[PDB]
């Protein structure tokens, strides 16, 4: 849910596959696989939940406010989870 | 690199569209926004058969899930908005199925 | 727009001087000219969208050609080497040859 | 910037306004009686120019002179290109659009059928099954 | 019968050639085609694309605008097959023996 | 082991080629038999054709040395010429295989000075006559290039038909022929561009009133001109 | 002991005397080139059915390879010229999958 | 590409062919073989080109030229296809 346990969360992912295999660890790894995605998730809401509530807000107003205008509200979401993405699973 | 969401979010603008082209009377515009809303992709084609005959929690999901996006009741008699129901539908159907939603505020 | 107009005319006027019809670029410039005067009434952000599938053409063939001047030069400097090292040596070859030849 | 309705609107208004459109088909037109012809079936040796292009417009923006706009459209067309592909191995290997494919009918029976009867929205349940009550 | 041609009528000679036993297609003699600038067209484009000879050579394909198919081959595909089937049999239909699948093509193709 | 067994089906099955193997072989399967194509029609060199020249039906003269006897076209054709096709036709005024007059350079320095000073350019010595397929190619591929070039211009059809008539007259290795057939549709392109450009840029002029003997007869018709 | 070239070269010289004999109104002459060409071939009498259905790549390749060698477009109407030009195609085809063709001058 | 290439190209081959047997051979050994055509196919085409071109030529032609009479445009090929073969896979 923190950065720290989801970056160990991907440790733990990425051993266990070396571990494993390249031929069996969607068959083995599945619940490390889950953990790691739910807290790069959690990550993510939380850094990004901002940018999705502007666009939902936006949504429902049609993008006829200011701050609707344009592609901003689109491409300020699609940049931070591309960020939190870069920042997690490298 | 991120599919599902760009095409989740051209869905959504693209409704949007349509229902300001409609209050506005714009026919052309919403034909245009009806035919660039992402009809060949395979994934929720696929999912169109798997949801229109699921049963239960997951159709109940995917009920709440469109019911938050879109709240209002569609006409029952024009198939254009049926059918960008369906659509919306499937893409939430197979987003479920592949990674199931988490709706309550509560959760650990 | 009539300036616009006058520009693409003296672009193609200059680019058909320029490029016969056995070059290969002729066609991909001549095409992004007739999509520039389609949308000379335009602005550059949508004129963009729809010169591309031109530009893209002639931006193909031109560094082709670019890449092919280049490849000709070296490839002829080296010959040009080659043949030169060996018209000298050919040259002190005669000159033993003349310091070792007999008679009068 | 406004193009008006009615430009002789105290008159134009009353006789003659302009009705709310009609967005199902052209209803200009003829009805056709038998649907679309199956498409000849795609596979990837179309897609020369979309890949190409998109190729070439990616290396140009990686130099900088292209934009992104370009590389979208190029990357979209491709995309559609490969989406003809797996949309047709869909329809033609899952089961459920083989009924779907070859559907046929006319607009009599159309008219005769019946399913407009129930085609009534349901009734929300109660708030005491909220408390189960 | 058979009178000279001039040189000035040569161009008119050769999309309207005299009749033959074996014609051609004169309304199709404007759509045959074969480029000899395919490859090399094809091989600069990729070279400015910024790519290696192997990967220009692995990415070549043939010209598609070529002469067109004759429709003959897929309409008449069955009566085809027999013929070649009969030739194969009876030693290229000498003597007429493929007389039968020949005329029905004959007769399929021209109606009279 | 012998060579070439299954290769050879025009022999197994006297099936010629042409009238001149039947001849030669004796096959007899041409019913109007052969009129043999003399050595002077076979082959030969190149000569100069005009009467406003001195040196006329005398053959071209090179650097190097070069066999003089020229070729001959057919000026006396006999009067039913069954083959009419273009590969029976050319051979009244070109020899299918090219002329005699190529060169062998001892060295490369001759090749390049001949060059330089326009005398030799092997697409006119060392080749053969193009066959009619190759020139519907040329002419076609030409055509679909100029057509995409520009599709709304009047002279298209006149500029490919200067090809086509360089093409049929063999401009590879008779260019000074080939361009006394093919200047007149040249011309023709010429008048079409200024034609064109009086359309687009609009260029007129003040016509004269009508002359009093503007008919030559009362009665007759004044048909009249834009 | 070269029997895939030799029949090709046959064939190659067959059509060609096929073209002189009609050029100079020889039915005798023309008859005998197609009775001679080669219509026992196993081979391409197997690879017949499979040219008449192959598509893409390799009918591609085929197609260029015929057109190289005959580019010609024959009469729709005439079934002789329609079968010979189906047995050249054919035994092209079994030629190109029993080695592929490589049409390119660039090569490596 | 070269004779000495395609002749250890063969040499390659046969040494392959002799380890695997004649059982296998087919099975084990398509590479190599593909890699020894391939180099005499070159050869051939270099040695052979002239040859071919003129059968092709005498082939546009109908076989009118004098260069066509008679069957040398067609044994000087045989003859050269021949003696590759000989000088290369023996």
Known sequence: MSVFEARSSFLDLEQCARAAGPQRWEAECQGVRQRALQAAADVMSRECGAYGDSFFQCYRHGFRLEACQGEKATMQLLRCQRMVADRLVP | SSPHMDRLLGDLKLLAAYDSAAGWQEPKAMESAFQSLSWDDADVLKALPQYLNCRGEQKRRVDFAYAALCPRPVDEKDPKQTLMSLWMKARLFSYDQKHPFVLSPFAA | ????????????????????????????????????????????????????????????????????????????????????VRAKALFERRAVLLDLVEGK | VRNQRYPASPVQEIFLPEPVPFVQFDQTAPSPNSPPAPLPSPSLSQCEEQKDRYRDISSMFHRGVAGAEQVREAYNSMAKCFRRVSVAEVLESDPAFRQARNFTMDLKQAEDDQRYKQLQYGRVPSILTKYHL | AASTIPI????????????????????????????????????????????????????????????????????????????????????????????????????????? | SILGAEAFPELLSKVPLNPQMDEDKHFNKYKWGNEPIPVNRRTGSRMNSSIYDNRNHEAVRHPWSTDARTFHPNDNPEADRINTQYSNMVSDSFPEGGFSDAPRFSSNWERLLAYHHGLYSPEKFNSTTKT?????????????????????????????????????????????????????????????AWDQEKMVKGYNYIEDRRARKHKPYIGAPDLQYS
Chains 1, 8 share one sequence.
């Open chain 6, 132 to 192: 009619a397929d190759e020139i519907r190619l040329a002419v076609n591929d030409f055509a679909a290039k100029v057509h995409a070039d520009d599709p709304k211009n009047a002279c298209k059809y006149l500029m490919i038909e200067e090809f086509k008539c360089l093409q049929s007259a063999q401009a590879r290795i008779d260019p000074q022929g080939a361009a006394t057939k093919c200047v007149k549709w040249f011309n023709e392109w010429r008048q079409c």
């Open chain 5, 8 to 112: 000035s009528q040569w161009p008119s000679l050769l999309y309207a050639p005299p009749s033959s036993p074996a014609n051609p297609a004169v309304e199709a003699l404007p759509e045959m085609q074969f480029d000899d600038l395919h490859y090399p067209r094809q091989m600069l484009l990729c070279r400015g694309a910024g790519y290696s000879l192997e990967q220009c050579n692995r990415m070549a394909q043939p010209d598609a605008r070529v002469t067109p198919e004759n429709p003959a081959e897929k309409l008449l595909k069955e009566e085809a097959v027999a013929a070649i089937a009969c030739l194969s049999q009876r030693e290229g239909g000498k003597d007429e023996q493929c007389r039968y699948y020949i005329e029905r093509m004959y007769k399929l193709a021209n109606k009279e």
């Open chain 3, 1 to 84: 727009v009539d300036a616009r107009e006058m520009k693409v005319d003296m672009y193609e006027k200059l680019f058909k001087q320029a490029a016969d019809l056995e070059n290969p670029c002729r066609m991909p410039g001549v095409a992004y000219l007739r999509c520039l005067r389609d949308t000379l009434t335009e602005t550059q952000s949508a004129r963009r969208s729809s010169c591309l599938n031109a530009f893209s053409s002639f931006d193909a063939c031109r560094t082709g050609l670019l890449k092919q001047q280049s490849a000709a030069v070296e490839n002829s400097l080296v010959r040009q080497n080659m043949a030169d």
